[PDB]
């Protein structure tokens, strides 16, 4: 049998954490230690997550009514001798264990998602991904998505995109391979440093915003983005017919690099034989009222023009056609399945 | 703040020790679970002086006075727990669907270290019987 011993005081530093098969494999990986990390925002309010290089799990504590005592094997300093009066049911004791901790709760891990904390000097990016409920990859992706550097405003980030394109085309920079040094030298070549806010960090920020890493060119992303800005500058006030506004919008362009148009690019940021700008974050966040106001805006909608306008709204995760038939009602035709509501 | 999980020692010890045979983990660790409150004396030091050779209820290990409070007998999945001199509890060794990781939170350095993994548990859900 096993002799059972208990310490008069247990260490509360030991804590039980639940092990998923994926975490069970990451931990049982002898090739790379320190692959999991307990991240969180602050020191008294925010939740706690465990992140790898690409995933995230939230912690959840569950208390139970049982006595859960952790035991370890030790070597007796002196031989454990005692009279065993019971003769039936007990074998000769060959091992001794002691209770070192007493857990009255378990800590569960369930996969989750992360956001950034843009409250505040932080200094470096590791300290921002430090005090932020998020992982590593999601954090750098969102930091590239928001044009952070501090955080560049829209006007400055897009004047920097324009000046960057002008300088890159003026020096005939290679489209296939670009680095921060060549572009930064191309921007501040004939201008002084006191009036040159476009430092190397700003260049890397504009790159990571309008491209991914050399930084490969995301042509559709940049061209469509510029078109959305033109929409914000022209039809943010007045609506206009489709043709004349297509002319006046197409008239605005970046410098030398060309841009192709498509029915897909001209979709998701305006509404209709008319056309006027519209934004997604300004619609009422309630689904039924959102579809109500959208139906109140256009008597008739297009499939390609409304499909990106509704994918981010409903968080059910169901199929697209189900989403469409759901809070509304279809009415297809020959060319494309359009929609109306009474 | 944030701190990494140190699993180097647990990995070295797992790789260097043999495969799990019984409910006891390869690191020489087990879990006992009791549906109840374990009533132990509040003053071990006083009773350790009153300990007689026949009882053998207390011993010294690394400066800590340990009490010998029971015996455990594992018969396959079936388990029987003797507590004190007068209690017998019937229970089972059951595999937890989600394994649990023991993590030591060293408050001094705010460091967390992987200690061991549960790997089954000996649970006792039935009323204790006479010996």
């Amino acid at each position: 049998s096993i002799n059972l011993h208990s310490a008069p005081e247990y260490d509360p530093s030991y804590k039980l954490i639940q092990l998923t098969p994926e975490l069970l494999d990451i931990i049982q990986d002898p090739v790379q230690n320190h692959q999991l990390r307990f991240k969180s925002l602050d020191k008294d309010k925010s939740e706690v997550v465990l992140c790898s290089h690409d995933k995230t799990w939230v912690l959840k504590q569950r208390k139970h009514s049982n006595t859960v005592l952790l035991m370890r094997e030790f070597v007796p300093e002196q031989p454990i001798t005692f009279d065993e009066t019971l003769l039936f049911g007990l074998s000769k004791p060959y091992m001794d264990v002691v209770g070192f901790a007493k857990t009255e709760s378990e800590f569960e891990t369930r996969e989750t998602h992360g956001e950034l904390n843009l409250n505040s000097v932080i200094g470096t990016l590791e300290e921002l991904l430090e005090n932020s409920p998020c992982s590593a990859l999601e954090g750098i992706s969102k930091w590239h998505k928001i044009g952070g550097s501090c955080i560049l405003s829209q006007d400055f980030l897009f004047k920097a995109l324009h000046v960057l394109l002008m300088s890159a085309m003026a020096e005939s920079l290679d489209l296939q391979h670009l680095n921060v040094e060549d572009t930064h030298h191309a921007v501040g070549k004939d201008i002084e440093d006191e009036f040159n806010p476009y430092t190397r960090e700003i260049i890397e920020t504009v790159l990571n915003k309008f491209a991914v890493q050399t930084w490969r060119l995301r042509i559709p992303f940049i061209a469509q983005w510029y078109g959305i800005q033109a929409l914000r500058k022209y039809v943010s006030g007045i609506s206009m017919p489709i043709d004349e506004f297509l002319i006046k919008w197409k008239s605005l362009f970046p410098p030398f690099f060309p841009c192709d148009i498509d029915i897909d690019m001209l979709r998701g940021y305006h509404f209709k034989k008319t056309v006027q700008y519209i934004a997604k974050s300004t619609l009422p966040m309630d689904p039924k009222e959102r579809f109500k106001v959208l139906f109140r805006l256009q008597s008739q909608w297009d499939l390609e023009d409304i499909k990106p306008l509704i994918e981010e709204l409903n968080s059910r995760g169901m199929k697209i056609d189900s989403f469409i038939m759901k809070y509304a009602r279809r009415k297809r035709l020959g060319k494309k399945t359009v929609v109306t509501s009474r | 703040p944030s701190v990494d999980i140190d699993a180097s020692q647990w990995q070295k010890l797992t790789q260097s020790r043999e495969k799990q045979t019984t409910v006891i983990t390869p690191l020489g660790m087990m879990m006992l679970e009791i549906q109840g409150e374990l009533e132990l004396p509040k003053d071990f030091a006083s009773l350790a002086r009153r300990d007689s050779p026949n009882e053998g209820r207390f011993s010294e290990q690394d400066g800590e006075t340990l009490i010998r409070f029971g015996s455990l007998q594992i018969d396959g999945e079936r388990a029987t727990l003797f507590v004190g001199k007068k209690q017998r509890l019937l229970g089972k060794v059951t595999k937890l669907d989600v394994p649990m990781g023991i993590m030591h939170f060293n408050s001094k350095d705010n460091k967390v270290e992987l200690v061991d993994v549960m790997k089954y548990k000996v649970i006792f859900k039935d009323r204790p019987l006479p010996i």
Binding site: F107 | L89, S107, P128
Partner: peptide, 24 residues
């Protein structure tokens, strides 16, 4: 020395975790 037997077993509803729950 004895065990005070609980007649049955209950696990409470899972709860969220804050930073202070881990570092008490």
């Amino acid at each position: 020395i004895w065990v005070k037997y609980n007649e049955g077993f209950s696990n409470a509803v899972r709860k969220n975790v804050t930073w202070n729950n881990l570092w008490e």
